[PDB]
Symmetry: D2
Subunit: 477 residues, 4 copies
């Protein structure tokens, strides 16, 4: 338009009266597709205060009724699927096929979470005291907040708000300043179906301003955020002031282990069909590939051939490409610098390794060989489509190198030996380990990272429980 978006506070869209706006750009063409308010703490406070006023009534509603509200939202999403998918493609730069999957998955995820209504249980504990009953109830936290990243922006809205609402909490969400459009569409659905005012709020702005208020406001019981480790650190430090609970997912460096006795065809496909599910921008797919000698040569060749076939370009104009552009300028620059450094350190460029120059932010699928566990490229989130390869002799070497990281969210291994599999599972220090398949968490699993990958977690029963707290009642006589 470029359309100027309003925030969603206390059951209604509120037109921004400030003079400062933030431009939302299309990563493929660099053109301005929309504008959002340069929100400030006060805007966050209004949303938080509204969420607080609505929380008692919301938690008082039988759980099945909150589930009913969630189902109305998912149904609204499916009705506007193509519209929302296009928004994601346009601002996030991901290929049409993946955007479509994200939208459909988000709706299914919400429905799945709504099913917890009559299932989350409190407990009755035996007491040492005659005639006493120890009742442990599961209560809502109260007001919660969600801070979202640019990757899987739409899904992450649901990943936080669905469990939050189901358990009786209210929420205030802030999407990334780079991908707010899909979030506005989510708010419109919430508004259209009539969700009780204050239960779901959407605030817009930067991390340093709005994000910080969502983390530091004393009325917030828990702050949930997904994205960079740097932002997570600032969020937690701020939450500390009020002893506010934090729920963080800060990505990492997913390592992949390919053994000699591994199904070469399966391994290569799993690694490329994972590093491709979002222009090589996801936090679950192998960013560190370890291949042992015995099969090294064969593996590197097939993998090299697979990456050559990977075409990049504008997602909106090409439905036959496997990769879109990077989110923004800084992202592209950091990729270049890291690849260059790697090369200077001794890394062998088997493919790509040269940034494209022109409209949008494109970087060619890059394959690096003769890489050393020591090199900085093995200890720095490379955003773009860069695959560093490291050879090894024994399982212990591979497991040891994979564990050698400040991140511990996702891992994977390919082999056919029972002992090797059980050994890798026991030795790998990660929240997730994929065996002979591609990386992608199920809604009923538990996406939780070790070390700097995060705190708490998301999805399944355990993800739902992050939004609940206990009240232990000692009923005497």
């Amino acid at each position: 338009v470029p359309v100027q978006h309003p925030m969603y506070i206390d059951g209604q869209f509120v037109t921004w009266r400030g003079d400062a706006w933030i431009d939302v750009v299309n990563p493929a063409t660099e053109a301005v597709i929309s504008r959002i308010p340069d929100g400030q703490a006060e805007d966050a406070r209004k949303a938080i205060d509204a969420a607080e006023r609505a929380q008692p009534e919301w938690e008082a509603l039988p759980a099945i009724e909150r589930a009913s509200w969630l189902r109305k939202i998912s149904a609204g999403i499916r009705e506007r699927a193509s519209e929302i998918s296009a928004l994601i493609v346009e601002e996030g730069g991901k290929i049409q096929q993946l955007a479509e999957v994200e939208v459909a998955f988000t709706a299914d995820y919400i429905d799945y979470m709504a099913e917890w209504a009559r299932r989350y249980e409190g407990e009755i504990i035996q007491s040492d005291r005659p005639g006493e009953n120890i009742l442990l109830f599961k209560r809502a936290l109260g007001v919660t907040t969600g801070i979202l990243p640019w990757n899987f922006p739409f899904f992450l809205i649901a990943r936080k708000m669905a469990p939050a609402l189901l358990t009786g909490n209210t929420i205030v969400i802030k999407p990334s300043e780079f991908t707010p459009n899909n979030a506005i569409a989510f708010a419109k659905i919430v508004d259209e179906i009539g969700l009780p005012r204050g239960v779901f709020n959407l605030v817009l702005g930067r991390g340093e301003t709005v994000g910080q208020e969502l983390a530091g406001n004393p009325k917030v019981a828990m702050v949930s955020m997904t994205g960079s480790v740097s932002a997570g650190e600032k969020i937690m430090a701020t939450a500390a002031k009020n002893i506010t609970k934090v729920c963080l997912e800060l990505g990492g460096k997913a390592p992949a282990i390919v053994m000699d006795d591994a199904d070469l065809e399966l391994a290569v496909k799993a690694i490329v069909d994972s590093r491709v599910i979002n222009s090589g921008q996801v936090c679950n797919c192998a960013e560190r590939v370890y291949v042992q000698k015995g099969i090294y040569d064969q593996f590197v060749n097939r993998l090299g051939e697979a990456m050559q076939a990977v075409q990049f370009g504008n997602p909106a104009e090409r439905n036959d490409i496997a990769m879109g552009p990077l989110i923004n300028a800084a992202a592209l620059e950091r990729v270049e610098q890291k690849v260059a450094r790697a090369v200077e350190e001794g890394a062998r460029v088997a493919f790509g390794g040269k940034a494209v120059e022109g409209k949008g932010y494109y970087y060619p699928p890059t394959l690096l060989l003769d890489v050393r566990q020591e090199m900085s490229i093995m200890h720095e989130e490379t955003f773009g489509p860069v695959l560093p390869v490291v050879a090894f002799d024994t399982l212990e070497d591979a497991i040891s190198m994979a564990n050698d990281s400040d991140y511990g969210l996702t891992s994977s291994i390919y082999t056919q030996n029972l002992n090797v599999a059980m050994k890798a599972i026991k030795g790998l220090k990660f929240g997730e380990t994929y065996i002979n398949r591609e990386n992608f968490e199920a809604m009923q699993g538990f996406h939780a990272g070790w070390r700097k990958s995060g705190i708490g977690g998301a999805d399944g029963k355990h993800g739902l429980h992050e939004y609940l707290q206990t009240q232990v009642v000692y009923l005497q006589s």
Copy 2:
């Protein structure tokens, strides 16, 4: 002696080579009973590095074997019970009877926790994918740290190390600089029974130095601490730098609600026999008493009479007193100032209200009437034996005032009406609610505070789980 204590690092006692020492004083006589090293970050690092080296081997041990080690420690504690009780009395200032209970309870707690060995379960989750198994294993965090307060110093050692060790973690503990003696005795038992080196480490020093290193060191998977909200804030802020998990218990202002239809005798006894279980220094017993009109006069009189009978003095020389001295000078001063402020604001002194002057730090049982929810005494941890009383008309008023606090750890109510009880339980926003009995958490319950009272929790199954993290394995075909 005054004996000069060494630290316990990597399976052996290490003599302090520094020139700076911290004097440990007897709160009843102000005499120096011992001295501990003015530990520094480097000392904490040595302990942490030792804990890291021992962790893999320790976690590799079958759980029942770790339990066996824990049982040896509890047995060592019971053998030295009277010796340890005296240490607690001497440095903590608590009465002989309570010290004895703390020691016996600590041993039982350790045994109870050891019983979790073959019981904590991982899970097997149904997958949407044909032939796939989703295995969710429960793994240890790795290296953990514990920072302890002066109240219930001995028990708190076990409250953190027992669950930690059982689940395969190693630990580094720092007792409060005011009550380290009981902790040294704990370390001697660990050393005598031969616990594998590095699994249990004891470092000595101040919070700003040693404590901060236990919270900020990158090798620490989780930092556990009990004490003041101010220290908890600094601990969490520091942990944020490395996205380190935190487990905090920061006390509060336990409110008590006395209804008209309440067993007057029971209520009064429960409130005084709780505010007395540690010279009125515990974080679970009523520090805010709400009494409704109908029974106000009767209740205040019986309560006043009960408090007059409360004798204070040196725990070591008197086994017939209900109260000992406050932990230190600053503690005593803060109590005076808060009582004085309360009075100036309109508070009516029905008993006590005047600090004692002489050796040690004694403050008389104080009863304040005509107090207003507004007054600062209702929003500030009063350490000493001060009981503020506030009258009310309806249950809703009492519940509303009790919830009006930045703390939400413990609560209580006295009544005989089914509807009133269920209403109080549903309305009270606390981690714990005691009905018609005194405040004291069971080892099988879950001591976890709401709002600023903390993060995570302790005791029972949920306390044990704080020391475990998940590893989700997607086994395809």
Copy 3:
């Protein structure tokens, strides 16, 4: 028609070739509404063999896919709701309003059960052996059977088949010979949506013949049945021959306790609005009323007035009545005999007590006073609308008399005292206890009777688990 119904075996309706048929009559008019085959063991065997052939493929399907099939069935039911409700009214004799509720509830129940797909969990247990993993998987039983009663005939189909199918089992169902029509309609929906052949089978006939084969066939992993204790005994005895698992619900004599401090209005309404939800033919609503002296007179009068307003008649022609006819002739006769015996024993008829003579099987709402715990009417399922009332002095007397029964499925009490409630809960020996409300189990609860009321149970997580068995895997190294 009277239409002649076929059975549903191995994915298709099979026309009966036998010469013997069973007439299905309308309890209100005694007219023949339909006819079903006088099935024999061989027919059951064909269904069981078909279920066996389909089970491996069915269990092999991801759980969410089985859930998808279940959702198609519930959706089919809602589409034909009015049609099915009429069938129930016509053959079961229940009032239009209750039939409608049963149908809608059945559909919601199926959807609720389908939600367990990704939720039922296996477990990972710590081993005493180094390097060993103990994996406990939840597997299907295989082929299961369901034998249904005439009360809530439609719902009971789902209560057994929904959990059975969800967990990977196949099933063969036999409805009561008195109420098979609603079951045929259920089979048509299964056939129309295309459920894989053999997964759901419907056989028709008597208990002694078809029912016995469903209990005694060696290929059946578990036999599930709801109805009379006499039939349950024969079913279990037969299952014993092959050590076949049994799941039984055999009704009982639900006792109700009315205290002096009880909300008289609430109590009376709860007792009449429960004894009315199916012409006084349900197995959950008070069939034994205990009222204490203090409020006796008041209670008996209000209750007497409430029962006078209860009109009986043909459900199909009257949508303003609270009661329909009894299921059959024998049922009516047994009611008469029991009321008469009661009277001869000293029972005081305060209302009704005289069977109606003419078309259909009607019995007037009957109120009996001055009844003694001793009388046989207190130890015999009275089918019809008969309410025996017994006075008592203390809570202990009431609890003791309520427990004095071979049945222990459902119970209830009305009071406002916290102590009384907790005392009743602790003292009452029943699978269910309702406090200050009417009797009706939630889908997320657990309907399981004590003593002769049954074995195993239905509904919620525990009901779902009845259809699962464990496979413990000891994976060494």
Copy 4:
């Protein structure tokens, strides 16, 4: 002596006044070692009535106090370990080493079970009704009974009474008429430590008499039994009369699968060191050995050599033998007949195959080759040390043949391929599957058989739950 044993009823030993006695013989020498009363139903009734009188008070005791009682019993057992081991050796015919293990294991098992005291949980379920709480409590069944077999006679006492007592139930136990001595010693310990009268009762006699009364008495909430499928059938049929819950373990035909890629050394040792842990009389060790072609010849030879080294004889006079005598004459006879039949059918005797003639009941380790899945020896519990071997080509053949049995308690497989292991686990229809190790259930697992192997189960959390039933409370407002 031969000593004449009294029963243990209502807290005291009761001298038998009947004229009929049953001789207890030493299976190695056929000499009379003791005599027990030929108990009758009335004796069982006295015990059951006593158990009923004590149950309310026992369940009323806090769970930890019941655990304390259990710990006193285990401690009493360890004090008399050698004495009890000798009793088992003498009457059961098992080798000294295994008897010692059984006694020590029994004591550890009791302690393990006592640890459930503060751990078994009830649940709090979300309701669809505003202001309603659904409380699911775990209650005791009441009076339970245990009927024991001759194998692992001592352990089985604890396997039933430990979980029973811990959860608040009382119990009446009847040991096998062939091995009652160890049970009398158990009763003496119970009497000496002072367990409340009626909680633990011991009755003596035959199955047809005393056993039947323990299964058919209306006051019994659940009957638990381990032994032959024939007796289990009679027990369940009788329990049916009162809809009495049953808990059965009826042995079976444990199959073992040896793949070509299997650790030959490990497999052979696991099979012989399992079939030897009780003179080849256990219900968990391979009684059906399936070996594939590729490794057949090698495996059969090593296995043949291992069995030759197996020496048999009097356990009391030889502490260097791997096998004792069979329990009784009928047992020996049935083994002969089955081996002979097998031979006539085409079975090739590679070793043994000829019954010993003289004092006691000895049968030589027998190895049968060229056996066919069809042969009756593959479908009949062979008691003695007979190992039938069957060759196969593919995994599917082995899995299919193993599943081809009316029993489904225990199974095992030896291989090194990840896919093979996961395939065997998924394909094998048994309550237990051992991979690359010998057969022996852990106390924290769940010993539960599929098909005719039983109903319900024992050990771990699930075994404990068999002794608990639910009480669902719907607390409105």
